[model samples]
Target: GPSCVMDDFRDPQRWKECAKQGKMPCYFDLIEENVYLTERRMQCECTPLSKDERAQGEIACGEDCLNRLLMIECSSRCPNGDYCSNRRFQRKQHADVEVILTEKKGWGLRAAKDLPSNTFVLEYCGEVLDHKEFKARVKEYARNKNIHYYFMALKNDEIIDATQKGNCSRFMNHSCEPNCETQKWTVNGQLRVGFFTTKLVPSGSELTFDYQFQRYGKEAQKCFCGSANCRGYLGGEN
Candidate 1:
């Protein structure tokens, strides 16, 4: 297995625990970029900001920018070029995170350093699958009894499966009261998910977000998130 340049982990007694579980789907290939399941390509529609707009302030394509208002990602065509703030996904503006063995949550993610509010944490990179494939894969994981599988829904029927190939973001667990949240962004006409901190996070604190998992036919799985408002189970539906 090739070591990931961006990944840092500390393993503690995983081999002993694997005996209780059937088999751990350990060591997935780390990919920094999203891989499309199909051979399709699309580009985002955007008009470059004017010279005046780019020079007006230090920030370019910020919250007040038209491209952001239109929910379009700035590309190489944007006049702001490298200065474009809206191109976080393309620029891979990722924060440092480390994987550590948690007490009861199996493996969990924690911040490697202190991060401010609304900081871009990590891009949820994975194999892009459509609605049909997404449904099939969910059932497939269920059949295998792999509760640790990662599946995040994207725009419409599209989904991101980080079970096989992904970054450290896959290790982030769910919390009823979460310090992070997933933000959907339009990048090159394709929907991408980025994890952002909701509030200031101190270094070494565990990173978490609400899974908002959709229930299928499977029974509700227990959520040991330990939040005050912990919903008892993973999904709302029964």
Candidate 2:
């Protein structure tokens, strides 16, 4: 007796039943092949960020730097199109701390409460800019001050322009062996940034993330991140 099999079984139960029955489901082999092929395609599609893009996303100590970071970072990851929601600090638990814009220091975050280890602390927002545009913007900002250390850039095939619609999370500074890490993802065709605390953070602790660059000289800038395994220099040069 010939069994009737649908071409594309939209129902998972039906498809599994067909497999359990020792029958070749509709497009079974083809679907499997396509799955494997898609995985392989993504593996091959991984791309590195361009140098200019890195520059535009660089952070420094100043008001302009804070604004750039806020605008660029927040706008990059909107789930919708290029337009981003109004950037504001979320008071919700685990929501990112606000960027304290002031005269003495450029920008920073206020610790709402004690943060636990491996916690999803907050997200950094920015715009998705190509390498070239990012570099031009950074260059304009660079002329204003004496940045003791080199800036770190996030690079992948896609660059998150940290200068567009930035969030308060950009206030997180660089640590060598940091207790937090940055993550990148796409939301509704826009690039987004997030962070997770690699370890526990006590109340009043300023959350820091690693820039992961070693270009700055060993003694370029003294990092006071207060991590037990602090590296002394910007990127933990020692």
Error of 1 at 47 (Å): 13
**Cα-based TM-score, every candidate:** 0.79, 0.47
Per-candidate alpha-carbon RMSD to the true structure: 5.8, 24.0
- Compared with the true structure, what per-residue lDDT tens digits does model 1 show for residues 1-238? 1112242322325533542452332567678788988756223334456678667765666667777766667888676677778778888778877666777777777777899998889889999888888878888888898878688888676789999888778978889999999988888777788899999999888899988857667577788899989987775464
- Candidate 1 lDDT trough over 10 residues, lowest sum: 1-10
Q: Please give the lDDT score for candidate 1.
A: 0.75
Among all candidates shown, the one with the greatest lDDT: 1
lDDT accuracy of residue 221 in candidate 1: 73
lDDT (C-alpha, whole model) for all candidates: 0.75, 0.44
- Indicate the residue-level lDDT of 135 in model 2: 64
Looking at candidate 2, what is the lDDT of residue 4? Answer: 27
Model 1 Cα shift for residue 45 (angstroms)? 14
